[PDB]
Write an enzyme that holds these catalytic residues in place. Structure first.
Site, PDB file in Angstrom:
ATOM      1  N   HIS A 305       0.893  -1.255  -0.015  1.00 14.52           N
ATOM      2  CA  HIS A 305       0.083   0.073   0.173  1.00 14.52           C
ATOM      3  C   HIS A 305       0.917   1.309   0.125  1.00 14.52           C
ATOM      4  CE1 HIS A 305      -4.259   1.919   1.167  1.00 14.52           C
ATOM      5  NE2 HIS A 305      -3.560   2.943   0.534  1.00 14.52           N
ATOM      6  N   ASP A 362      -6.836  -5.691   3.235  1.00 15.12           N
ATOM      7  CA  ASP A 362      -7.631  -6.323   2.189  1.00 15.12           C
ATOM      8  C   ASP A 362      -7.223  -7.725   1.801  1.00 15.12           C
ATOM      9  OD1 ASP A 362      -9.081  -4.007   1.964  1.00 15.12           O
ATOM     10  OD2 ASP A 362      -7.707  -3.148   0.619  1.00 15.12           O
TER      11      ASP A 362
END
EC number: 2.3.3.16
Lengths: 426, 426, 142
Positions: A305, A362
């Site tokens: 990320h 996620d």
């Protein structure tokens, strides 16, 4: 206490600018009145430009810190609940019993969607993506609930908001049932936000549906871990659109289309191309697809990320929860043992240590949802449904800031004035 | 040309900042490196920040300049037609008869919208404000046209450009018909863009419709004059939604919403409250309503504009156009002498003359549309409809540059890390 | 021989031939061609069964779907043992197939259905029902 005093810009003479301090993070150079001197800055992407002052969420990317109203994410994700966290995001402080109970009540009493919107759904294809349907219905909510588009009215705004929080889940679950060919389910004022959602997701007339406590608890944490995530592209989209006075719903609908933009925007085979080469080179039970696939890495599959340097602070609870669920559903998630191998690969494979592709939230949210039995396409839908309370917190914080209208400049480098002479006839 | 080389910022250490120059307008200071160097500016509204480099539209309000690819809006409106302006805006150059024919044929090749979409129209309540139906329909397109969503794919952006380009007049025409209860009218190939639109809005199956050549030009002009208007609010949202991946169909839907936000965002009686006091105090045939109404002035009524100082350059040819239309619709345009009176007021009243509430383009457009039987519910739909090319172009441009995702900073001013201990027990 | 029939004849005459066992005299042909033309438009309610099938449906799955639902609409021509009934059916099914097949295609692609044109040959009418739209005249290439 360093340069907390001032600063100066010199084109060919001096100009003194303030340097407002924040309660956390970096302080900013106030350049608000420069424009009124012709002096402009150039910053595509705005990564060196504070577009607003906010008191909702704080993130120190490198320290893997995620704060919501000051409350550590892992603390909320472990000891709170979605609504209580929704209350904190929208109200700035943890609620009293009376404040909370009041809030809750209001939310359960408006969880239904106008009978006329049920028809809209039906006008869509059954093979349509649940996210597209999701955008379509949300972008159309303005043609119905036309009693709250007055953005400058705290009454309308507060109502508009409450409707989103109440209806989003009903809406999200209805995309699913329509996507699989099952009847839509009406909320149950007796169940919890999470338990109620799971029921609308999986309830069938054939018999009463009972939600698993660990599953109910798991979903509530998935939501908590998605409630908000600061000034990202999608929130900035909700903020900018709202700056012009665009009704609440239209702004929420843009946040969704914005949230999955990286998904469809990839390509008919971006992170999908290799999801097809798992048939000819399936001689190796792992590196065949989702292990040789990413030629153009993706944080959309659960690895890495841009925000965080070493890890996702949201992955802590989500992983612990991910263990309890696989453990719970037991002999249904035996096959989904590739979860520890992808986690293994990400952690050890040099390609992942090199690109710092760590399992983010996620990654484990995906594991839990697959375990529960939720199709892949329904992931950003649930993600968006959860983030809407955050989008509302921002869009509302924006409408209290004097609501400065997003009116940027541009470095114009085109043709200077030139006369026009057409050489056609049609 | 004095310091179009460099300059310096001084907080605690001098930073070398290059000054970028434009071909027209002000210059800029490349600050895309401060961010990293732990330096952020603060500009809510971006009034002092260039959000990008553009070559499409140059504005100079103080002097009333407006150029589309170097061409003055005046010539374009008089010497060109809407379709060529579309080509120009999109490609940066005027078309050769061959390129024009090719461009015009492609457009014509994509006018009919999928029939299932036409089934979404019957789901919205008849009463719906057409502009709420336009955001509703445009935001549902992605579900039907799912193959042109790879925004990073060059061939995809083009297919979208034409899809959205060709179909807006069709959908806008349907929005009107639908609200009034008449049958939808299909696109006619043997009809110009402007004439086809007049035909799709006003004809019925009961008698042939005569496209008056006069109105047909007045429409075209209305369309060219609303083609683009640089980095305004709605266009800023477009690029912002798009930079975050969002599909093209969703961007325009967001733009469309940001465009008519000030319409309903004023109040259920913003510029409407006094539209109701035209019954009790109608003793004076003018200052009763739309002459005593604006307590909180509005450029949405066609008076003044935050961009242009003394006059709206677009309104020149629009005022001329307005004249011919009234001079054509003869004994159906007489009552409309309140336009003659209103202008006179915006010209010779101290208040207006003081706060420069000069009649802008929409003033004359409105009268033309109002004189054309067109309902005020459709005024925005046309503006947005026309403005679509301007959005597509800006969206296309943003990608070529690199689609720099929107990730602005914030000045965190909320709580410092505090511990959470649930105050509730429910 | 199929060769001569394909070169020297057109589909409609071959229909007559196959059905009656003989080639038609201009009068019988006109009479046969007029009857066919007299039953081309399918009942409108049937056209409402089309909007129930998902758009994605393989047209051939929609054809079995629609053809198997006809009996519900054309319920008076079902006495297979009655000679007049077989004839009404023959023409009903004869006349309406090109219509329904044309709809199967249009439906799958999202364009509006096109009605049967009397002034058009069986083959030209079908090309017309498959490819024309309300946006421009369609030129049936010979």
């Amino acid at each position: 206490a360093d340069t907390k005093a001032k600063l100066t810009l010199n084109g060919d003479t001096a100009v003194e600018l303030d340097v407002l301090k924040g309660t956390l993070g970096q302080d900013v150079i106030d350049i608000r009145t420069l424009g009124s001197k012709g002096v402009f800055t150039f910053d595509p992407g705005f990564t060196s430009t504070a577009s607003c002052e906010s008191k909702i969420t704080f993130i120190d990317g490198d320290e893997g810190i995620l704060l919501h109203r000051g409350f550590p994410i892992d603390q909320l994700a472990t000891d709170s609940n979605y609504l209580e966290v929704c209350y904190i995001l929208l109200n700035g402080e943890k609620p009293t019993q009376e404040q909370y109970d009041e809030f809750k009540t209001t939310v359960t009493r408006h969880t239904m969607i106008h009978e006329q919107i049920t028809r809209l759904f039906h006008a869509f294809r059954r093979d349509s993506h649940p996210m597209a349907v999701m955008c379509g219905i949300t972008g159309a909510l303005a043609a119905f609930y036309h009693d709250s588009l007055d953005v400058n009215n705290p009454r309308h705004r507060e109502i508009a908001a409450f409707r989103l929080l109440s209806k989003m889940p009903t809406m999200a679950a209805m995309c699913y049932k329509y996507s699989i060919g099952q009847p839509f389910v009406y909320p149950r004022n007796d169940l919890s936000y999470a338990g109620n959602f799971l029921n609308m997701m999986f309830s069938t007339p054939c018999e009463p549906y009972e939600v698993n406590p660990i599953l109910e608890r798991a979903m509530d944490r998935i939501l908590i871990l998605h409630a908000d995530h600061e000034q990202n592209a999608s929130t900035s989209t909700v903020r900018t659109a709202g700056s012009s006075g665009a009704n609440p719903f239209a702004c929420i609908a843009a946040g969704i289309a914005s949230l999955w933009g990286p998904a469809h925007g990839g390509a008919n085979e971006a992170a999908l191309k290799m999801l097809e080469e798992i048939s000819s080179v399936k001689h190796i039970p792992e590196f065949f697809r989702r292990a040789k696939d990413k030629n153009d890495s993706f944080r959309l599959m659960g690895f890495g990320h841009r925000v965080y340097k070493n890890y996702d602070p949201r992955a802590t609870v989500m992983r612990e929860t991910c263990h309890e669920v696989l453990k719970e559903l037991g002999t249904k998630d035996d096959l989904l043992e590739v979860a520890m191998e992808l986690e293994n690969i990400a952690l050890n494979d040099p390609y992942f240590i090199e690109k710092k592709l760590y399992p983010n939230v996620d990654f484990y949210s995906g594991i839990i949802l697959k375990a529960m039995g939720i199709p892949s396409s329904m992931f950003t839908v649930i993600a968006a449904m959860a983030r809407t309370v955050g989008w509302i917190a921002h869009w509302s914080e924006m409408h209290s800031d004097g609501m400065k209208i997003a009116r940027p400049r541009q470095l114009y480098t085109g043709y200077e004035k030139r006369d026009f002479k057409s050489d056609i006839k049609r």
